[PDB]
């Protein structure tokens, strides 16, 4: 339920409020409040404090960037209480060492990548040009061109001198190093002519395209021989530096984040000229620790824990879930949506009340339940390993508390799933082709089943009736909660709207079961007339022109409950057809392909279960969020968020 979130007023000195802010950040269980304009200053405390906070924030950003360059991640742990100068001295040394090592490793990798392409070509060009490199007669433009279209480039060389303008490729058969040697200026004009024919000389980077080709190939072979050992040494040094300094950087960044959060929270204070005001909101379940922290002031400097506002107009005040531990695990799926208006109803119990009972009616396969039990054992072993739920495939990093809540929800769902699957009387599709443990009236072999789930002459009508009954009960619960919240918030429009929607739905269901359903339309004729009159009376008392579309939308939300029975029967029919085809082509085909046919049928059934059960389990919670939330509103102002001080640890 929505907690109190009661207010907390406090008055202190400037430095005493700094101490009390450090206390209330260590006791970080109260969201803050500015309240600056009410006859006080804005607590622009000090530009020296602003500069020290900027220095600590730069230290924290440098610690984050140093963990990033070292490869470490933002792993929260206990802080390191030390001076800011000592923190800078600890941080900047390893940060500078890692930055220099990373720059050297990137430069060595770029040098190796550049040397991997022009090692053999520059060496071949220098080998052909072993005496003609830099003597001041003629340039030799080597162009790394394509395969043997050497006459298309040599057209310009034939336009040049006869027994010279040697434009050919002696070696480097992959990328043909077409050396063209004519002159200096005449070969520059011929290089312009070859570029007009389409050409590009080997203007390499570094010292390769900035020195003579013999020294270029020599430095290329030298860098090629030096790059691998230097890159491996840089990788080993980076790994050793990260493994040696990651814990110190993490503790330093934790203390830096703590002090920076203290500075940013003290920025949101209210100072009173060597006095200071403080305003917060904290839940009722932590009032004792708040009073114990407030007693730890200078002389318990004058504060008060005052009450929060009522159901009317609590806008900036946040709320909380506050569920029991048997129902606490659905709080994540509850918080996937928005928050309530601190007086709006918490429908989080309806999730654990209705979603597993619907999912067990959907998933009646006890082999799928055993696979879910094995997957829950795997998730329980992963949570016992206490690692982060890390999947680089999905790029999903989830907390271990999230995995534990998911495992608890999976166990609570698997209980009702096994219950309704034994009520369905089906296991792994159908092992009943071999071992008919669920007895049928058509095939009496063992103890009976409640619903055979392959029969539909009576089971389908009863299943549709039970699903429609559960859905109409949930719709009536949503309309009743809407009218109750309209009465509790003193909003008679919402209460009259819920009453009129309930009366219209009751009259519509009565008229349906009278005219289109069974006989004896006399006892319910006045009931349908009363439902129509109640809808018309609430329309007249509302006068909001809430037309027939709202009633038809409520009718569709009620009728959506048969989709659960449809999905359960569809999954059951698919699993029964798959198990029947496997049993036929395994046992009825000689009973010798029992193992191979059973394995192929199990692979196909696992693929079909992975393809279908995700959407099948998704549609229950989707229909629940579509029906119960929208019948209760749940899209009005989205609540206010509870954000106390961190003490991130």
């Amino acid at each position: 339920m929505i907690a109190p979130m009661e207010k907390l007023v406090l008055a202190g000195p400037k430095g005493r409020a700094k101490e009390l802010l450090q206390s209330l950040q260590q006791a970080g269980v109260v969201h803050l409040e500015t309240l600056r304009p009410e006859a006080l200053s804005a607590y622009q405390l000090s530009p020296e404090e602003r500069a020290e906070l900027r220095r600590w924030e730069a230290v924290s950003a440098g610690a984050e960037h140093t963990l990033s360059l070292l490869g470490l991640e933002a792993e929260p742990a206990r802080p390191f209480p030390e001076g800011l100068e000592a923190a800078e001295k600890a941080l900047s040394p390893i940060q500078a060492h890692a930055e220099g090592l990373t720059r050297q490793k990137q430069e060595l990798e770029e040098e190796l990548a550049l040397a991997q392409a022009y090692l053999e070509p520059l060496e071949r060009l220098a080998a052909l040009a072993h005496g003609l490199d830099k003597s001041p007669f003629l340039r030799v433009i080597p162009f790394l061109l394509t395969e043997k279209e050497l006459p298309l480039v040599e057209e310009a060389l034939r336009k040049a001198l006869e027994d010279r303008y040697l434009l050919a490729h002696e070696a480097y058969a992959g990328g043909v190093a077409a050396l063209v040697v004519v002159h200096r200026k005449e070969v520059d004009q011929a290089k312009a002519a070859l570029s007009r024919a389409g050409v590009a000389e080997l203007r390499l980077p570094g010292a390769l395209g900035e020195l003579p080709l013999s020294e270029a190939a020599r430095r290329l072979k030298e860098r090629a021989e030096a790059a691998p050992r230097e890159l491996s040494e840089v990788r080993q040094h980076l790994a050793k530096l990260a493994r040696e300094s990651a814990s110190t950087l993490q503790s330093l960044w934790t203390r830096a984040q703590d002090e920076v959060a203290r500075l940013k929270a003290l920025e949101e204070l209210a100072s009173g000229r060597f006095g200071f005001a403080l305003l917060g909101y904290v839940p009722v379940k932590a009032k004792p620790k708040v009073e114990e922290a407030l007693a730890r002031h200078k002389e318990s400097v004058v504060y008060a824990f005052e009450p929060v506002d009522e159901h009317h107009e609590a806008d900036r005040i946040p709320v909380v879930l506050d569920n029991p531990p048997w129902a606490k695990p659905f709080e994540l799926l509850v918080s996937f949506l928005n928050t309530p208006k601190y007086g709006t109803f918490d429908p989080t119990p309806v999730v654990p009340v209705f979603f597993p009972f619907w999912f067990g009616m959907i998933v009646g396969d006890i082999g799928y339940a055993l696979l879910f039990y094995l997957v829950g054992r795997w998730l329980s072993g992963y949570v016992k390993r206490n690692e982060p739920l890390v999947i680089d495939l999905f790029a999903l990093k989830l907390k271990p508390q999230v995995i534990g809540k998911l495992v608890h929800i999976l166990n609570w769902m698997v209980f009702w799933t096994v219950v309704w699957g034994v009520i369905y009387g089906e296991f792994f599709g159908t092992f009943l082709e071999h071992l008919g443990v669920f007895g049928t009236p058509e095939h009496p072999g063992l103890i009976p089943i409640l619903i055979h789930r392959i029969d539909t002459a009576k089971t389908a009508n009863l299943l549709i009736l039970l699903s429609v009954a559960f859905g109409v009960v949930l719709v009536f619960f949503g309309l009743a909660l809407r009218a109750y919240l309209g009465l509790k918030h003193r909003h008679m429009a919402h209460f009259w709207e819920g009453v009129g929607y309930l009366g219209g739905l009751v009259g519509v269901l009565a008229l349906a079961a009278s005219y289109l359903g069974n006989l004896q339309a006399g006892w319910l004729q006045g009931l349908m007339y009363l439902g129509f009159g109640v809808f018309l009376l609430a329309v007249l008392m509302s006068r909001i022109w809430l037309m027939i579309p709202e009633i038809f939308t409520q009718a569709g939300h009620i009728l959506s409950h048969i989709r659960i029975y449809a999905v359960g029967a569809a999954g059951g029919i698919l699993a029964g057809l798959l198990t029947d085809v496997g049993f036929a082509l395994a046992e009825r085909l000689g009973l010798l392909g029992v193992l191979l046919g059973l394995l192929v049928a199990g692979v196909l059934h696992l693929l079909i279960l992975l393809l279908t059960t995700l959407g099948h389990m998704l549609q229950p919670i989707r229909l629940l969020w579509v029906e119960f939330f929208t019948k209760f509103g749940f899209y009005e102002e989205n609540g206010r968020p509870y954000r106390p001080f961190k003490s991130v640890r």
């Binding site: 007023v9 309240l35 009410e38 006859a39 006080l40 009173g272 006095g275 200071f276 305003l279 005052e306």
Partner: protein, 43 residues
């Protein structure tokens, strides 16, 4: 309440501003005493 913050800050700031105006009246009486004894000493 926020008026409660206004009140409990007005308490402190008016007592401290009373101490500041006491300090400046004190300094004015220091000026009076110094000039009186200095002129009597010169005479």
């Amino acid at each position: 309440g926020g008026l409660g913050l206004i009140k409990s800050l007005a308490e402190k700031e008016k007592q401290l501003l009373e101490r500041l105006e006491a300090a400046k009246k004190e300094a004015e009486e220091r000026v009076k005493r110094a000039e009186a004894e200095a002129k009597a000493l010169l005479e």
